[model samples]
Target: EKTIRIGFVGSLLFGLLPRIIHLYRQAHPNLRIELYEMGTKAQTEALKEGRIDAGFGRLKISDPAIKRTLLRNERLMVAVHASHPLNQMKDKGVHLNDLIDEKILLYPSSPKPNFSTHVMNIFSDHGLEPTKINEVREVQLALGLVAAGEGISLVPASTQSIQLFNLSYVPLLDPDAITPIYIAVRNMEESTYIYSLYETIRQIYAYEGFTEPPNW
Candidate 1:
């Protein structure tokens, strides 16, 4: 049986990963794929340690031993209660400037610091800081709090498909407020299995008509 080891971050655990898993199974019925859920840092370490054949996440690696493939660029969006005033704004959506005084719920920094770091930088760039800040262990928890009207959050645009009842996501107005999600593999040897799976994921994203939203 052809076996492949895959590591990914929390962002894809519920969203893109499931669809990829289904498609991969259809293409390689006899393949055995192992999935690991980790942060970008851990995913990078695992890739270098030979613990995983492929790593998927928003990785920031300067290590010469690793190779990365750009999958797509994902935008950061504002997640707020559906009834939040920003939703009814005449301008149509919220902007980073509009959020200067809003409470911000941030994702955990330990296992996944990329999202939180980028968010803080965005705020810093605007010469502002969140009025109130709460750190949640996971994205689901952060969104749950937003749904409960506790606070607003910044999340990937792709997360809008999660369809949390009381939450709505609005694109950030800044063009640079985006994250690049990638597929990573070791540089030492090329595996056809990894390449095949990567191509499958690429095709899946293309089929879904992913593109940077023009308005943002």
Candidate 2:
């Protein structure tokens, strides 16, 4: 009877989600997680309509109908083919200025204010306007294109957990090269299950050696 409907994006699956679910279940044996995968825009709508109890995604939307809690500003890493010249920048990190000439891969072009937009904005913030952006569908496709030497893409640091053949994720040196994941819920709705889920996420991240950011 203890069920909490959670909305999320597909990218989280390769990160700490599996562990989070395992531990969350271990602690709340009776808890039920009804996870629905959706984009940021859709997640916001889902939260406002009471379709989902909680939503985990990147990007912030202005909606009085929903309250968004920024979980963390996760590092952004560049994904490139193993043989690409950019791999050499791994130690010092690849600067956004240097990525302009390379073919940049992006994902989920629609549903404005998406993850790719964040990445592009980071480049724009740094005054780096890349011209060779390919709009791929998702992370998997982006990574696949990267492995094929078709282009390079940006991904969250957590994505390093899942490896694909002939593809590598390198550190992004720019200070603004980071993305965020948020937990959204209906305004004034304080669900105990949601709060515990937040704590559970931090627990796993800490156990995995992710230092907590200030004021988190």
Candidate 3:
């Protein structure tokens, strides 16, 4: 008779959630699962405000009030203009040096203290500060920024479907950088509902080739 409130990143809602909804419904027929697609910051705030039962995103928060786990690492890829010289380096992948002095676009949802910090590191390692940091709010806006030659973006490899007329993707080398997504609950003892939902997601992502590692 109890419903499970599920919070997930916006990225998952576009593809992964539909499958999760289907499989979870079959696995727990009597339980209701509600999915909320909130941005990473909002998701964290929701968890703190009790607006969501559980939260998921590409983040790591070391708060004693929450129970968190690394769900999986989604590799970061270089989003570049198809006509750019960088596209020629696509086959071999690229390093931050490859984009030195090149305008770079960034996602607003990118992991704080990790993603951008790492990006900056990669560039520093190559003695180059990115030509520019074009901050955009969403994937589409980032794509548009890339299309307009404003900058290239680093994105998760999972978003292979986000069409950028002038852009293509190349995996980042060296660090083999990843967007490590995390899942959190206010407290594990709050309910077993989220665990059940997590199991459902783990199986689905594994089936979908996401390769979720077992937590328990």
Q: Which candidate is the best by TM-score?
A: 2
For model 1, the superposed segments whose C-alpha errors exceed 4 Å read: 125-128, 211-216
Estimate the TM-score for candidate 3: 0.81
Separate clash counts for every candidate: 0, 0, 0
- The better candidate by lDDT, 1 or 3, is 1
- TM-score of every model? 0.87, 0.90, 0.81
Q: Scored by Cα lDDT, where does model 1 land?
A: 0.77
Question: Where in model 2 is the C-alpha error above 4 Å?
Answer: 211-216
What would the per-residue lDDT of candidate 3 be over residues 8-92, giving only the tens digit for each residue? 7666554566676787788788887777876556666777787788777766656667777777777778888898888898898
Quote the positional error of residue 192 for candidate 1 in Å.
0.4
Candidate 3 ranges with C-alpha deviation above 4 Å: 109-131
lDDT of 3 at 94: 81
lDDT of 1 by residue, 1-216 (tens): 767888887776656767887898789888898898787778778888889898888757677888777777778888888789887752466678888778889886565456677678778877778768878777888899899989899888777767788788877778777767877788774677876777677767678887522210
- Pairs that clash in candidate 1: none
Model 1 TM-score relative to the real fold: 0.87
Q: How would the candidate models be sorted by lDDT, starting from the highest? A: 2, 1, 3
Which window of ten consecutive residues has the lowest lDDT sum in model 1?
Answer: 207-216
- Backbone clashes (count) for model 2: 0
Instruction: Give the alpha carbon lDDT tens digit for every residue of 36-110 in model 2.
Output: 878878989888888888888888888988878776778889998888889987787878888899899998666
Evaluate model 2: give its TM-score: 0.90
